Every structure is written in structure tokens, then in C-alpha cells.
Design a binder for these strands. Structure first.
Ligand SMILES: Nc1nc2c(ncn2[C@H]2C[C@H](O)[C@@H](COP(=O)(O)OP(=O)(O)OP(=O)(O)O)O2)c(=O)[nH]1
Ligand SMILES: [Ca+2]
Ligand SMILES: [Ca+2]
Ligand SMILES: [Ca+2]
Ligand SMILES: [Ca+2]
Length: 341
DNA sequence: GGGGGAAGGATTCCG
DNA sequence: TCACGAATCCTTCCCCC
């Protein structure tokens, strides 16, 4: 089986460059302004120019401005990036029936039946890159391998504006050389757990008793890592369906005052329903981010769909539950709808 | 003993 | 300040035969 993974380069910022080309060549920072003060918030992403100086996704906007005071700072316009993405996804859909859109700027294509060997795979990769650049003026990076995980790793190694193939022979090498922390799904928490067990590479997962691994990182993560280490991981490319829709907003100031919090909560509900469109959820969860940036939530699943009036009513009750069961002040408040009919 | 579900949270980083 | 949306999985609790 041959998998071709496509990941768009510094996506949000590149889209802003496409819409305003005079931005090209200069540091561009797309920001998420939270409203607590002047430039409160964090960076969603920055172009490679800005990243050379340490400005990238996740850092505080104020910290980015200390480093690059003259960069161009733009507010994130997700709806715009989403429409551009969809167009790109429709182009890729032209190169394969088996396609998995993994996110706003990532997709996996099973090109096994329309290509022989990695030579043709590579060539199809170039045609894809070129097609997207000519049609949308968007550069992307392509990764190709025997399964989804190595196709993604391949792209990560080839970024930006690249293309790379990880053949059956390199897979074997990577299993031995690749820091296990570099494997998708292995975050900081899991990587530390694995280090303690003496697992530094995928290979290491083969000489440890499974029950021991499972006990430390969970059955699912253990079976996942072992399958990869055995060169046996082979998850099919399939359509992904959205399972939940929600919105969470930052309040000007922290609070525990119901009447002060409600307006934010209600705006979150209105936007969430607009997003749901025709989907009707049976579950609602109120999510709160506390002053110490901890996350707490309380939800309820109904035996039927939730009307907006029901959502307003139930949300207030769930919020009251949070306030009653957690003494901390609330900093961010929101809702999430799931279990669609 | 174990088959669901549901609730709240841990992790991930797919953003 | 993780200074800002969504999926999978895990633990615990609960109902039931
Ligand atoms: N709000 C927010 N958005 C993010 C964050 N990380 C990524 N995004 C958004 C903007 C990114 O352009 C988009 C795609 O994420 P990617 O991880 O693929 O990074 P990008 O595409 O920005 O850079 P890349 O060339 O792939 O290294 O998702 C984040 O931490 N917060
Ligand atoms: Ca990307
Ligand atoms: Ca991506
Ligand atoms: Ca990692
Ligand atoms: Ca990322």
C-alpha cells in the first residue's frame, strides 16, 4: 500500500500572503487576540521568515512583538482559511477516491491502485504540488510511505515546500533511529513515561513486556507503538466525520459571578448553533478554563435533540454546577455540542 | 464477572 | 500565564442479568 500525505506550508499565514502579496518576504504573524489587554493572546502560526527568530505557534503575542516589533501582525480569520482549504481538498479529491481529510490543512490519499512503485508516487506528488501552486498559489509539502504515520513523518522531514519518500528500507532504519518522541501521538507526557521505561526508540518497545507498557501508557498507545515497531501498522484511509462543535471565549476579567459570565456563555452558544447548521446534538458540555488555566467541564446527554432554548437553560445549570464544585474564578467559558442525530 | 453507557478528565497538536 | 478547536482514550461510577 502507498500513502501520499499532503500538509500545507505555514498555512494561515501563507493564505494571508496570497490575499495580500505585498506581505511576501516579510515576517507575518497570525494572532489570536483574547481581549484582556492590548495584545493579550497567542500566535496561531507565523511564516518561516518570522519563525527564524523564534516566533511561532503558541507563543504569547507580546513575546513575539518583543522579538520582532516590526513584523506584520494579523488577526486569525479562520473562515477564510477554511474556504481556501476546502478548495485545495477538492483538488486532491481528483487524485484519489480513497482520501482522508485529517484537518484544515492535512489530507491522506491512498494512491495504491493508481500508482506502481515509489517512482510514480513521487511523480504524482510533484503533479499535486504543482497543481495546487498554479491553482491556489499555495505551496505544500508531500510525504509518501507505506502507511499514514510514516507518510506524515516523511512530510515533517521535508518541510517546507518539499516532497519525500520513506521506502520500506528507510522505515526499518527509522524504527531504530527515530526518537520515539518524534512519533505522532507521543507528546511530552508519554515521552517521559517511555524514557523511564527505557524506551528511547520505537525498537525499544519490542523488548518490553506488553502488560508493563500497557500499565504505563494505556493499551491503545501500547498496541499502537508496537504495531509501528513491528513494521505492521496499517490503518486504512477513511472519511472523517465531525463529531462535536463548540466555542469557548476568554472573558475580559476572571469571575465567579453568574450574571457576569452568562453573556459570554450565551454568545458561545449562539455561535455554536450557527456552526452546527443543520446538525442536531443530543449532548451539551459547558467547559470552563479557570484562573490557573486548568480546564473543568460538566455535561449532559439527552434522549433527544437539544433545541437552542434547551441549550440556554441547561448551560446555566451546568455552569452553576461548575461554580458550586470548583472554588476557582473562571477565565474562559464555552460550550461543546456532540452526539449528533 | 462483564456488557454497555455516561461523565469528567488526560493527552495530543491532527490545530 | 501552556498569556488561544476537536479527537481518542482512560478511569470511575452505575444499572443490570
Ligand atoms: N489557534 C491556533 N492555531 C494553530 C495552532 N497551531 C496550528 N494552528 C493553525 C494555523 C496553522 O497554519 C494551521 C496548520 O497547522 P500546522 O501545524 O500544519 O502549521 P503551519 O501549517 O502553520 O506550519 P507548517 O509549514 O506545517 O510547519 O493550524 C495553535 O497552536 N493555535
Ligand atoms: Ca501545515
Ligand atoms: Ca498540519
Ligand atoms: Ca512529540
Ligand atoms: Ca502543529
Amino acid at each position: 500500500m502507498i500513502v501520499l500525505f499532503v500538509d500545507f506550508d505555514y498555512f494561515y499565514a501563507q493564505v494571508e500572503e496570497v490575499l495580500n502579496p505585498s506581505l511576501k518576504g516579510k515576517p507575518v504573524v497570525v494572532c489570536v487576540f483574547s481581549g484582556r489587554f492590548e495584545d493579550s493572546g497567542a500566535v496561531a502560526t507565523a511564516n518561516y521568515e518570522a519563525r527564524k527568530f523564534g516566533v511561532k505557534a503558541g507563543i504569547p503575542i507580546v513575546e513575539a512583538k518583543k522579538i520582532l516589533p516590526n513584523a506584520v501582525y494579523l488577526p486569525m480569520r479562520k473562515e477564510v482559511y477554511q474556504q481556501v482549504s476546502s478548495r485545495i481538498m477538492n483538488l486532491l479529491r481528483e487524485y484519489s477516491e480513497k482520501i482522508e481529510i485529517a484537518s484544515i490543512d492535512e489530507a491522506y490519499l491512498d494512491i495504491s491502485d493508481k500508482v506502481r512503485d515509489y517512482r510514480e508516487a513521487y511523480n504524482l506528488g510533484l503533479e499535486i504540488k504543482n497543481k495546487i501552486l498554479e491553482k491556489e498559489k499555495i505551496t505544500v509539502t508531500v510525504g509518501i510511505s507505506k502507511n499514514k504515520v510514516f507518510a506524515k513523518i516523511a512530510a515533517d522531514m521535508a518541510k517546507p515546500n518539499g516532497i519525500k519518500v520513506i521506502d520500506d528500507e528507510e522505515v526499518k532504519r527509522l524504527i531504530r533511529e527515530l526518537d520515539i518522541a518524534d512519533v505522532p501521538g507521543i507528546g511530552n507526557i508519554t515521552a517521559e513515561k517511555l524514557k523511564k521505561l527505557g524506551i528511547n526508540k520505537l525498537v525499544d518497545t519490542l523488548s518490553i513486556e506488553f502488560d508493563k507498557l500497557k500499565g504505563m501508557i494505556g493499551e491503545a498507545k501500547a498496541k499502537y507503538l508496537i504495531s509501528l515497531a513491528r513494521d505492521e501498522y496499517n490503518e486504512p484511509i477513511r472519511t472523517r466525520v465531525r463529531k462535536s462543535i463548540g466555542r469557548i471565549v476568554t472573558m475580559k476579567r476572571n469571575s465567579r459571578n453568574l450574571e457576569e459570565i452568562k453573556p459570554y456563555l450565551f454568545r458561545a452558544i449562539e455561535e455554536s448553533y450557527y456552526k452546527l447548521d443543520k446538525r442536531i446534538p443530543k449532548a451539551i458540555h459547558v467547559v470552563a478554563v479557570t484562573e490557573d488555566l486548568d480546564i473543568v467541564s460538566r455535561g449532559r446527554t439527552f434522549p433527544h435533540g437539544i433545541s437552542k432554548e434547551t441549550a440556554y437553560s441547561e448551560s446555566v445549570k451546568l455552569l452553576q454546577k461548575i461554580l458550586e464544585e470548583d472554588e476557582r474564578k473562571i477565565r474562559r467559558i464555552g460550550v461543546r455540542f456532540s452526539k449528533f442525530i
